[PDB]
């Protein structure tokens, strides 16, 4: 018989589901909601400067803990200013709960609702106190079940409406007969394949199925490969991945193994023609088994309403235990050996600088990367996780994602890599580190250029950018910046950054135009063909 303000019921429902913080920027229509969030302290409230960062930070927080992210905005400009970040979270299967303030029920372009419907899997306007609890459960349940963003619009006069507490997600029971048929066909297909391959992908991480999938991989007995967004999965498994598939720029043997498989089990994979993703045009659709978005497709036919977790358990029930292991193999060889001299800096030198510290005893940091050669370089860095817009490829994610991740990392420092073009977009969010109580290390790749674009159209003058003095601007926003031009300066700056806590550390690495990471070089050489 208890009841609470609608806003409080929502905040508690989010916390009940694992949310760790709420990022946001208020406005008139959202002020009452922000007041409840601040006064109740149910979720830590972190504000940022610009809405893109609110969305990227919530996305990063969701990815960091494989839970719900929370992004709060105000009606109109505020919400429209987060459309790109939300689209990116949708694209990369990250459940960001977008909460927008809205005009009261009694109160220029609804357009906003229509736009958000295009980039979320469920929406609700909480304008009826009696049904709000069920609607919140339905919408948050969809976010969790599909691992994609959702939209909640709260009229300002409803924030304080009394409602009953939010219950559990509505349960959608799987058809046992269909699941059995699905598991049987999938297993039969893997057994009939001359070259079966198990790809561990994004949904495995999002749904927290790492342990179950490590077990499945051991029992299935086929080669394991990860997709870009599955990087690091099963690293501690009995049969760790042979490597990561990233398309033309990756290991040739891995690329062929994936593309020539006649039993390619895409366990939770996002398919697209984007650079690093598994593309339908490069694989055998007559033999691929795509388990994704609560469905399983093979031989052009689909089993509906098959959650990934259920499929994995069904396969385990049909497989005998195994003690097989492949861990006696040699570990991956990362680029190391930075020559700390007076020579200029190349992207690979940044990778070597980071890797050398790790080899010398530094526990690796999780890396947040923006889109650009910084990402191609980060791929060769030893990390405690990599968070980047590898498929969506939108710029601006980097710095805000590092900030969002460190806000929920419980003390673990984050390393962010970002190019000059991307920094001009959202790097300024670092001015918020002092209030947030964080101190990320940021390596800014400054080549005074939109280099990825120059690489593919070198004759154009518009890719030449001005020389912005980012390191000189760091103090103005509360951080310690240093511009480095030589490998010796780079080595020294990285050590100093790790030795200095309390303020964000910005290392502005000057890189000449035309100098690329090894992976980007291979990508370019690959396209030419």
Ligand X SMILES: Cc1ncc(C[n+]2csc(CCOP(=O)(O)OP(=O)(O)O)c2C)c(N)n1
Residues 80-139 that bind ligand X (CB under 6 A): 81
Residues 404-463 contacting Mg ion, CB under 5 A: 419-421, 447, 449, 451
**CA gap 236, 215 in Å, rounded:** 11
46 within 8 A of 20, measured Cβ to Cβ: no
Indicate the residue among 211 and 285 with the shorter CB distance to its own copies.
285
Can you tell me whether residue 164 is helix, strand or coil?
coil
Does the annotation flag 447 for ligand binding? yes
Q: Which does 452 bind (CB under 5 to 8 A by kind): Mg ion, ligand X, Cl ion, none?
A: ligand X
Task: Figure out which of the listed residues 271, 414, 438, 510 binds its own copies, where binding follows CB under 8 A.
Answer: 271
Q: Shortest approach of its own copies to residue 487 CB, angstroms?
A: 24
309 token code pair: 């977790």
253 among annotated binding-site residues:
no
Closer to its own copies by CB, 121 or 346: give it: 121
Among 135, 373, 380, 489, binds ligand X (CB under 6 A): 373
Binding range to ligand X, per CB under 6 A, among 63-71, 164-172, 246-254, 372-380: 372-380
- Yes or no: say if 207 and 95 are a contact pair by the CB < 8 Å rule: no
Q: Please identify which residue in 137, 165, 178, 193 interacts with its own copies, judged by CB under 8 A.
A: 178
Site for ligand X in 39-78 (CB under 6 A): 51, 74, 77-78
Residue 41's contacts (CB-CB under 8 Å, 6 or more residues apart) are none
Contact indicator for 235, 215 with CB cutoff of 8 Å: no
Considering only residues 165, 310, 344, 431, which one is a binding residue for its own copies as defined by CB under 8 A?
Answer: 431
CA–CA dist 42, 12 (Å, integer): 7
* Residue 467 annotated as lining a ligand binding site: no
- Residue with smaller CB distance to ligand X, 293 or 451: 451
Q: Out of 301, 329, 501, 528, which residue is the one contacting its own copies (CB under 8 A)?
A: 301
CB 292 to ligand X: min, Å: 24
- State the minimum distance, in angstroms, from the CB of residue 222 to its own copies: 21
Interface segment toward ligand X; rule CB under 6 A; list 25-33, 195-203, 217-225, 244-252: 25-33
Q: Tell me the CA distances in angstroms from 453 to 371, 457, 503, 525, one per residue in order.
A: 12, 6, 33, 15
Residue 421, interface with ligand X (CB under 6 A)?
yes
Query: At closest approach, how far in Å is the CB of 447 from Mg ion?
Result: 4
Residue 398 found at the interface with Mg ion (CB under 5 A): no
CB of 63 to Cl ion, least distance (A): 13
In angstroms, the CA 63 to CA 308 distance is 18
Residue in 44, 118, 167, 343 binding its own copies, rule: CB under 8 A: 118
Least distance between Cl ion and beta carbon 371 (Å): 17
Tokens 């709420």 label which residue?
22
- Give the total of residues touching ligand X (CB under 6 A): 27
Contacts of 298 (CB under 8 A, 6+ apart): 185, 186, 189, 287, 288, 289, 290
Based on its alpha-carbon atoms, the radius of gyration of the chain, rounded to whole angstroms, reads 24
Among 76, 335, 390, 419, interactor with its own copies by CB under 8 A: 76
C-alpha angle 518-523-527 in degrees, rounded to nearest 5: 150
Whose CB is nearest to Mg ion?
419
Distance of CA 45 to the CA centre of its chain: 21
Q: Does 244 bind Cl ion (CB under 5 A)?
A: no
Give exposure, 387-404, as e/b (b: 16+ Cβ within 10 Å).
Answer: bbbbbbbbbbbbbbbbbb
Q: Which of 33, 167, 151, 30 is nearest to 95 (CA)?
A: 151
Q: From start to end of 429-504, where are the E strands?
A: 441-446, 480-484
Per-residue 3-state assignment (H helix, E strand, C coil) for 196-265: EEEEECHHHHHCCCHHHHHHHHHHHCCCEEECHHHCCCCCCCCCCCCCECCHHHCCHHHHHHHHCCCEEE
Q: Decide: is 368 part of the binding site for ligand X (CB under 6 A).
A: no
- What is the SS3 assignment for 136? helix
Q: Rule CB under 6 A: is residue 420 a binding residue for ligand X?
A: yes
List interacting residues with Mg ion (CB under 5 A).
419-421, 447, 449, 451
Per the annotation, binding residues are 51, 420, 447
Which residues lie near ligand X (CB under 6 A)? 25-27, 51, 74, 77-78, 81, 371-374, 393-396, 419-422, 445, 447, 449-453
Q: Which positions make up the binding site for Mg(2+)?
A: 420, 447
Q: What are the binding residues for thiamine diphosphate? A: 51
């Amino acid at each position: 018989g208890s009841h609470m303000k609608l806003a409080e019921a929502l905040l508690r429902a989010l916390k009940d589901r694992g949310a760790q913080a709420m990022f946001g920027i208020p406005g008139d229509f959202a002020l009452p909601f922000f007041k409840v969030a601040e006064e109740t302290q149910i979720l830590p409230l972190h504000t940022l400067s610009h809405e893109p960062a609110v969305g990227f930070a919530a996305d990063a927080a969701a990815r960091y803990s494989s839970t719900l992210g929370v992004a709060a905005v105000t009606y109109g400009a505020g919400a429209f200013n987060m459309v790109n970040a939300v689209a990116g979270a949708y694209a990369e299967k990250s459940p960001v709960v977008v909460i927008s303030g809205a005009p009261g029920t009694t109160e220029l372009l609804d357009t906003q609702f229509q736009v958000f419907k295009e980039i979320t899997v469920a929406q609700a306007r909480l304008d009826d106190p009696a049904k709000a609890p069920a609607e919140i459960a339905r919408v948050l349940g969809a976010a969790r079940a599909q691992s994609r963003p959702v939209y909640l619009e709260i009229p300002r006069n409803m924030v304080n409406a009394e409602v009953e507490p939010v219950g559990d997600d509505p349960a959608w029971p799987v058809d046992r007969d269909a699941l059995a048929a699905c598991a049987d066909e999938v297993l039969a297909a893997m057994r009939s394949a001359t070259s079966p391959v198990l790809m561990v992908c994004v949904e495995v991480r999002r749904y927290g199925l790492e342990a179950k999938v490590a077990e499945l991989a051991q029992r299935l007995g086929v080669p394991v490969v990860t997709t870009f967004m599955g990087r690091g999965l099963l690293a501690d498994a009995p049969t760790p991945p042979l490597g990561t598939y990233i398309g033309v720029a990756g290991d040739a043997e891995i690329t062929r193994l994936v593309e020539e498989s006649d039993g390619l089990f895409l366990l939770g994979a996002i398919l697209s023609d984007t650079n690093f993703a598994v593309s339908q045009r490069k694989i055998d659709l007559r033999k691929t088994i795509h388990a994704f978005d609560r469905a399983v497709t093979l031989g052009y036919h689909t089993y509906a309403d098959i959650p990934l977790a259920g499929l994995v358990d069904a396969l385990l029930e049909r497989l005998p235990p195994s003690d097989r292991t492949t861990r006696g193999k040699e570990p991956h060889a990362y680029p190391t050996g930075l020559q700390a001299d007076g020579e200029p800096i190349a992207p690979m030198d940044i990778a070597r600088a980071v890797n050398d510290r790790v080899r010398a005893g530094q526990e690796p940091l999780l890396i947040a990367a923006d889109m650009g050669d910084c990402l191609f370089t980060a791929m060769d860095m030893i990390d405690a996780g990599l968070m980047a817009p590898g498929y969506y490829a939108g710029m601006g994610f980097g710095v805000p994602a590092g900030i969002g991740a460190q806000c929920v990392s419980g003390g673990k420092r984050i390393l962010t890599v970002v190019g000059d073009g991307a920094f001009q977009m959202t790097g300024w969010e670092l001015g918020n580190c002092r209030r947030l109580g964080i101190d990320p290390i940021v390596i800014l790749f400054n080549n005074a250029s939109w280099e990825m674009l120059r690489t593919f159209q070198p004759e154009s003058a518009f890719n030449d950018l001005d020389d912005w003095r980012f390191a000189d601007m760091a103090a103005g926003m509360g951080g310690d910046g240093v511009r480095v031009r030589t490998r010796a300066e780079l080595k020294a700056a990285l050590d100093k950054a790790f030795a200095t806590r309390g303020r964000f550390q910005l290392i502005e690495a000057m890189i000449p135009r035309g100098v690329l990471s090894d992976t980007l070089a291979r990508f370019v050489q690959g396209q030419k063909r």
